[PDB]
Amino acid sequence: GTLFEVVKLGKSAMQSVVDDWIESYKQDRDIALLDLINFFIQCSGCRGTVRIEMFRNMQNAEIIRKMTEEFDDYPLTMPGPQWKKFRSNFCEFIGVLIRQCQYSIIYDEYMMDTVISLLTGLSDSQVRAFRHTSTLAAMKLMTALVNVALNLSIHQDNTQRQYEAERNKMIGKRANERLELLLQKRKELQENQDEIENMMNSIFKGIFVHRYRDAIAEIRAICIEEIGVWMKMYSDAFLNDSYLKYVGWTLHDRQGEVRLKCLKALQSLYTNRELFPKLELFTNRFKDRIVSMTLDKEYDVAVEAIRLVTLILHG
């Protein structure tokens, strides 16, 4: 509208184009998902693009095989001023996309299933460009969903408090309308969080447990950093010995970049004198490796290992 109106309402090009994509998704899910598929293809530097006939007929396996052939050094590796902000932008786009879709579209069984299936497929590609782009996308996706789960939890607590105040207020009285709405609201929100847990499982089992072991050091670094982020954000789901294995194991990685990430992840956990209890078996298992890395070889890795060890000591 007016210049004052557009300034007082700071929609970035990303927020604006995610809002347009959502309007497009509501008119025609198929062309919207086709554009979202093409986005992830273009973001790998792949020169091909999927048309509706391929989308509606061909499996993701065939689409990826056909797009693999159309490959001429991809956006995420590019040096130059015109690609500086790409990684940061690509990451924020996925956050904005899912933040916006979090109350309706995410729970439709079509959109998240399409993306995750494409990303899982591209994460199994021989092409480094596809594996790098899809994995970083999946890692930021999981974190977007973890924030969705965090938001649900708040609404679940308020729906719970409201049901408690009504369940009490009745007692000896036939369960009125308000108590049946609240009892249904509460089922819905838990059923919503099951679907989020479901999507997180597909991403973890499909992408993470394969990509954290990837040939490319930067792909291993991307995975480790983000399981670190999930473990801090969403302690009860992600902070356990099964998931911690991956981070702790990777302390033996051959590259400074990756060993540096493992320590930064553990650092953020051990600062919180609260989930320190849940790190007791892990500290016992990997004290030797953590402690050894204080004289790592890579100065900066050693500095972090020392900072980690001084955090473990103080607790």
Positions in the binding site for ligand O3A (CB under 6 A): 241-242, 244-245, 248, 281-282, 285
Long-range contact pairs involving 111-115 (C-beta distance under 8 Å, separation at least 24): 111/25, 111/29, 111/33, 112/199, 114/33, 114/36, 114/37, 115/36, 115/40, 115/141
Give the residue with the Cβ less far from ligand O3A, 196 or 244: 244
Exposed e or buried b per residue across 181-217, where buried means at least 16 C-beta atoms within 10 angstroms of its C-beta: ebeebbeebeebbebbeebbebbbebbbebbbebeee
Contact 44, 63 (CB under 8 A): no
| In the complex, least distance from residue 309 CB atom to ligand O3A, rounded to whole angstroms | 17
Cα within 13 Å of Cα(133), Cβ side: 29
Is the Cβ of residue 21 or residue 282 nearer to ligand O3A in the bound state?
282
145 vs 305 by CB, closer to ligand O3A: 305
Minimum distance, C-beta of residue 29 to ligand O3A, in the bound complex (Å)? 40
- The residue number with the shortest CB distance to ligand O3A is 241
CB of 285 to ligand O3A, least distance (A): 4
Interatomic CA distance for residues 112 and 199, integer angstroms: 8
| Distance from C-alpha of 206 to C-alpha of 99, rounded to nearest angstrom | 22
Query: Is the alpha carbon torsion for 214, 218, 221, 227 positive or negative?
Result: negative
Q: Is 311 exposed, middle or buried (0-12, 13-18, 19+ CB in 10 A)?
A: middle
185 vs 285, beta carbon nearer ligand O3A: 285
Kindly state the smallest distance separating residue 161's Cβ from ligand O3A, in Å: 35
For residue 273, the minimal CB distance to ligand O3A (Å) is: 18
Nearest-approach distance from CB 288 to ligand O3A, in angstroms = 12
Q: Which is nearer to ligand O3A, 241 or 274 (CB)?
A: 241
Rounded to the nearest whole angstrom, what is the least distance from the CB of residue 227 to ligand O3A in the complex?
13
Calpha distance 304→307 (Å, rounded): 5
Q: How far apart are CA 303 and CA 299, in angstroms?
A: 6
Nearer to ligand O3A, 121 or 228 (CB): 228
